[PDB]
Amino acid sequence: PWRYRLDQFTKEEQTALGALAWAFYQQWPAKEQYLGLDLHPQAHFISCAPQAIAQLNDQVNGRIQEMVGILYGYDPRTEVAIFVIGPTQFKLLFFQPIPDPASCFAALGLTIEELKHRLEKTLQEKLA
Amino acid sequence: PWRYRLDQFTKEEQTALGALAWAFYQQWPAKEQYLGLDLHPQAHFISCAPQAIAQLNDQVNGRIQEMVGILYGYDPRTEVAIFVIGPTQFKLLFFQPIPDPASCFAALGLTIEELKHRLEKTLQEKLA
Amino acid sequence: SIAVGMIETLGFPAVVEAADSMVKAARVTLVGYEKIGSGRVTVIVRGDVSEVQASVTAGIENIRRVNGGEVLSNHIIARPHENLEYVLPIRYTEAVEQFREIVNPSIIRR
Amino acid sequence: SIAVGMIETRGFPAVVEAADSMVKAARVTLVGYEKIGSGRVTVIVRGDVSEVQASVSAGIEAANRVNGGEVLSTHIIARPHENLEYVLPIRYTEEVEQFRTY
Amino acid sequence: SIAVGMIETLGFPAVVEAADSMVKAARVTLVGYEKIGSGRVTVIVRGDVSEVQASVTAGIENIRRVNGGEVLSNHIIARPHENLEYVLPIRY
Amino acid sequence: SIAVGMIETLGFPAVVEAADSMVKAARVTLVGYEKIGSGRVTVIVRGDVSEVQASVTAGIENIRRVNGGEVLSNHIIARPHENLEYVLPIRYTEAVEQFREIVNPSIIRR
Amino acid sequence: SIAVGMIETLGFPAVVEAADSMVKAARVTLVGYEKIGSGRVTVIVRGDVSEVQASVTAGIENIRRVNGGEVLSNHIIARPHENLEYVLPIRY
Amino acid sequence: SIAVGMIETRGFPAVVEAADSMVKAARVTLVGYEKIGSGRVTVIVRGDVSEVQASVSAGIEAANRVNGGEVLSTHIIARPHENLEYVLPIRYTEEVEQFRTY
């Protein structure tokens, strides 16, 4: 069950994911890009403009309506909102870390390359 | 089981039973005796006073209460009411024949002994 | 001739007193207990028409014994003839086999 | 025979307190919880008539002490007919057999 | 033993606001809802009498914010007799 | 932050309009339809707390469109975070696969 | 093409006095009883429109003989559309 | 999309006449019968908004033609949001898929 691994990956890697989110948010501080995951061919992080995910919603007749609203409303200083692309479904990694994402990034002291490589290596092991 | 055989017996022999009931009623014009049926060892007709079945009702703590009320209330000119003693169960042969009991007795031209004998031969072969 | 007697109450304690009075006041059998919602409950007895009539009359008045008892409706319906059955608990087997001793195999007066 | 005691109320919290007080005030067994609609619920106890009487009285007074409690009707039958046992839900169930005394 | 707390409301949204406030205010086990007609629904929890008391109190005051919600009754039993566990729906 | 919005009505057509209006007025998911008897029915939506607020508001206002619609109660409850899931019918596989062709995998600005 | 007859009463004894009369007054098939709340119960029968009409008329007449009973509504549809058979409880 | 039309009556005989008139007056498919208590029952039809509008209008007038018929509420939605189909009982079922001719 890949939908089960992501829930424990979210619970276990809560600090590193918050450390990746804020650093990504530092690159796009006006929500120019949403942070996301693509599980195929293997788990790797991706991004998209908010307009892209809104148009996909129109194509699917508003079946990812709520995710577009959550992605529009979440506070990057307190919340992590990462969308996952499944085979023909979406999962939203959505949580409020302790500590805040900025504090997570300062605590781990890693750069965005290390956080990206570490989390993907770990997430691929949950799936593989 | 044997319960279904009595139902079919009551349906098939409603004229003979209506005749036997009328003949039995002629001997007790005030219902001083109730017509009954005992299946063990073989099915045979019996009789008892309206005191014996009510006494039995007290011994069973009023569990055959309705049967003694039906035996008390039935019109012999139009209704046949024959109690059957089973293993530890009591079943009524309760029906309104067409034609009425007296017409059944005149139609068949049989004696009460002939009615009792032949009816006691059909059910036995039906139970066995 | 048999019939069915029914008492509908607004409230469960009253319907229990109704059912208890009916089987105690006449020679009827409590056969059913129905619920249609909205606090309406009904108990049904079956037996000889005269017994049913006495059960229902003595079921309605005794509702007054219940603190909060209220009757909604009551009715009696004639029923077709039926080969009624009555199964006794196995502890009465000694009460049944001796009843066979008091009956005689002869149905002739003289 | 063994008596039957019943307390009917308007509201679920009051019926629980009634059942709790009845079963704590005397040697009775709570055997039934009956729902008939319109907010009317009844709790049913079985036991000795003198114990059932003490349970119902304690249940009524306690059900009134509940914030929002309202008792609708109340009845006791000392010697209920054997026919009622297997038609109305006033019977000893196997789940409450252990709590039965003699 | 294990206390029982009950809040009875008129209407489904108010009984949802009751349950959410009760679980969020103390370590109590939500055991379910009970519908008895006339729109009356009761939410039931189990736990320590101190925590159950904190749940019920946090349930009552938090319902008066529900637009259209009403509290009908509420009750706490510190030590419910074991007989009740096998007749009333207060465990599951 | 996500929340849950509820509208309870007295009548089924009104609850259908409430649900339809809530999912059209804001970005929420209709997650529930509950029945407690007595003609009281509730529809439940979930989504971003700002979206949920706009859904309930427009859901209550649009009941006026319903000939005979009547609102009984309404409430909004804050919900903890959750990794929400959305399964799409198999006919949207191409649309998802084309969106996968639009994203980029280099999330690091070089 | 098989007509449907319905008598809706307030109370259980009246709906039984409706059903038994409808069965005794003509050749109809008792479909069953429908409960919709507020003490409203409906008895449903099928058959020829002439037989259904006779049973409904006799059912309405006999309810006035019920102490406390009451007729709330009654209706007959001679040729109900086939669609209704798979949604409404009008068949056996 | 496919429109949805609803007629809610206080009384079951009236809701049957409402459903019968709707499917006889226009090209609509009776898909649902919903009971919410207190005597409130609703019949649901699906079809073109033009046919649904004619069917609902005919169902209302005939439901009041019933002895004791009482209409409580009525509503039509021309293009219901996709989310409604799998949460509310307004969906096409296989039992009525024969009467669906599109």
Curated annotation (Swiss-Prot), chains D, H:
Keywords assigned: Bacterial microcompartment, Carbon dioxide fixation, Carboxysome, Photosynthesis
Ranges for domain BMC come to 3-89
| InterPro entries assigned | Bact_microcomp_CS, BMC_dom, BMC_shell, CcmK, CcmK-like_sf, CcmK/CsoS1_BMC
> Where is it predominantly found?
other
What is one GO biological process annotated to this record?
photosynthesis
The subcellular localization recorded is: Carboxysome
Gene Ontology cellular component annotations, sorted alphabetically: carboxysome
Cite the Gene3D superfamilies for this sequence: 3.30.70.1710
Say yes or no: keyword Calcium present. no
GO MF annotation, one? structural constituent of carboxysome shell
Is Translocase one of the keywords?
no
The UniProt function text for this chain reads: One of the shell proteins of the carboxysome, a polyhedral inclusion where RuBisCO (ribulose bisphosphate carboxylase, rbcL-rbcS) is sequestered. The central pore probably regulates metabolite flux. Hexamers make sheets that form the facets of the polyhedral carboxysome.
Subunit info here reads:
Homohexamer, might also make dodecamers. Interacts with full-length CcmM. Forms mixed heterohexamers of all possible stoichiometries with CcmK1, which might form dodecamers. Only very weak interactions with CcmK3 and CcmK4 were seen.
Q: Which PANTHER family match?
A: CARBOXYSOME SHELL PROTEIN CCMK4, PROPANEDIOL UTILIZATION PROTEIN PDUA
Q: Which family does it belong to?
A: Belongs to the bacterial microcompartments protein family. CcmK subfamily.
Free-text comment on this protein's domains from its UniProt entry: The tight homohexamer forms a pore with an opening of about 5.9 Angstroms in diameter which is positively charged. The C-terminal flexible tail, which is the most variable part of CcmK proteins, seems to be involved in packing of hexamers in layers.
> What is the protein name for this chain?
Carboxysome shell protein CcmK2
Please tell me the species this chain comes from: Synechocystis sp. (strain ATCC 27184 / PCC 6803 / Kazusa)
From Swiss-Prot, chains E, G:
Which molecular function GO terms apply here?
structural constituent of carboxysome shell
Q: Which gene encodes it?
A: ccmK1
User: GO CC: one term?
Assistant: carboxysome
Q: Give the stretch of the parent protein shown, with its full length.
A: 2 to 93 of 111
Keywords assigned: Bacterial microcompartment, Carbon dioxide fixation, Carboxysome, Photosynthesis
Which part of the chain is the BMC domain? 3-89
Coiled coil start-end: none
Q: What is this protein called?
A: Carboxysome shell protein CcmK1
Task: List the source organism.
Answer: Synechocystis sp. (strain ATCC 27184 / PCC 6803 / Kazusa)
- Record-stated family: Belongs to the bacterial microcompartments protein family. CcmK subfamily.
Record field: transmembrane: none
